[PDB]
């Protein structure tokens, strides 16, 4: 037989293999097994295969596996600052984000990442800006909010958002999310337009509220013991490469998200575009700037206020 690869690693996610994560995951590790002349090997496990997203932190941070992406939010149990980019209504337009992302914002969290011994690339990759889902009715407003059983992501800052909104939420990993809906363990949830595609979302929501609630994407983890294992060159080429596909995921997830209304509504979506003020409004006065401002601390938060600040 052909001997294994000197490392063959692997890369957990939590998306759909239609998804831009999982094309463009395909074609980074073509290009790295080519690269490398054979030497690294990034075995691709998409979906949840190997288990979930509170799972899978656990066994980036263990070497379970090698490679992982993250949400931020999802992190920050760990990484406490890696929420900060998660602040409802924070950033008005990908301009802004990307400026801080892949600026000092986004320096400053991936500091905080490797404190916390993880590695971490430099450029993070798209999910979106997110949006409602409903099997009850929409939400034009915050008080529409009041009682919803919303499913978010297993995080502190979903969690305040959504109870700040007077809203349910349940704390339920990606993979449980279409059963949940469907049987109406909740009544709705949360996401950009491109999952709600690609994981047909569609098939067990009514509705689709354009709440644009916060932006957020995936940090690509890697195991640290495991990267430094890499020897110099072949981590250079893993790091390009890397960082490569997401700049080409970032450009596909974009176009997704600010076309896929039209698709969607003749899938079994009626959408509605809220107005969004009011629900600013009600995190103010439930006093979620507040709380963040205070657990964040005045450096970060002043950093945070720098980055959505600019205009161009
Ligand atoms: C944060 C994240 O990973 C998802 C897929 O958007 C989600 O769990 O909703
Ligand atoms: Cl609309």
């Known amino acids: 037989s052909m001997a294994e690869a000197e490392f063959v690693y692997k890369y957990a996610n939590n998306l759909p293999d239609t998804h831009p994560m999982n094309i463009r995951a395909r074609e980074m590790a073509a290009a790295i ?10 075995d691709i496990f998409p ?15 263990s070497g379970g596996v090698e490679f992982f992406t993250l949400s931020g939010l999802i992190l920050s149990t760990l990484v406490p600052a890696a929420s900060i980019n998660g602040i409802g209504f924070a950033f008005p337009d990908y301009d802004t984000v990307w400026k801080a992302m892949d600026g000092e914002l986004g320096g400053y969290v991936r500091g905080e990442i490797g404190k916390a011994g993880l590695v971490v690339m430099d450029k993070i990759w798209d999910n979106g ?6 099997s009850t009715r929409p939400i034009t407003g915050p008080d529409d909010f009041k009682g919803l059983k919303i ?4 995080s502190p800052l979903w969690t305040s958002m959504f109870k700040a909104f007077d809203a349910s939420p349940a704390s339920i990993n990606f993979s449980e999310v279409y059963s949940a809906l469907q049987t109406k363990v909740v009544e709705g949830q ?3 337009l491109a999952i709600i595609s690609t994981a047909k979302l569609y098939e067990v929501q009514k509705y689709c509220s354009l709440t644009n609630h ?4 995936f940090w690509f983890l890697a195991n640290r013991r495991a990267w430094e294992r890499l020897p110099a060159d072949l981590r250079d080429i893993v790091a390009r490469n890397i960082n490569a596909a997401g700049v080409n995921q970032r450009a596909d997830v974009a176009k997704l998200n600010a076309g896929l209304k039209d698709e969607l509504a003749t899938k079994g979506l009626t959408f509605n575009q809220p107005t969004i003020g ?6 103010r006065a439930a006093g979620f700037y ?3 401002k205070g657990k964040y601390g005045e450096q970060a938060w002043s950093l945070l206020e720098k980055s959505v600040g600019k205009l161009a």
């Open 290 to 292: 507040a709380e963040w």
């Open 190 to 192: 949360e996401n950009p």
């Open 151 to 154: 499913r978010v992501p297993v």
């Open 33 to 42: 097994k080519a690269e490398t002349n054979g030497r690294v090997q990034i």
């Open 214 to 217: 916060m932006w957020d994407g």
């Open 47 to 61: 979906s949840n295969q190997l288990g979930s997203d509170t799972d899978m932190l656990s066994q980036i941070r």
């Open 278 to 283: 009011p629900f600013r409004d009600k995190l």
């Open 129 to 134: 800006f997110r949006q409602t889902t409903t």
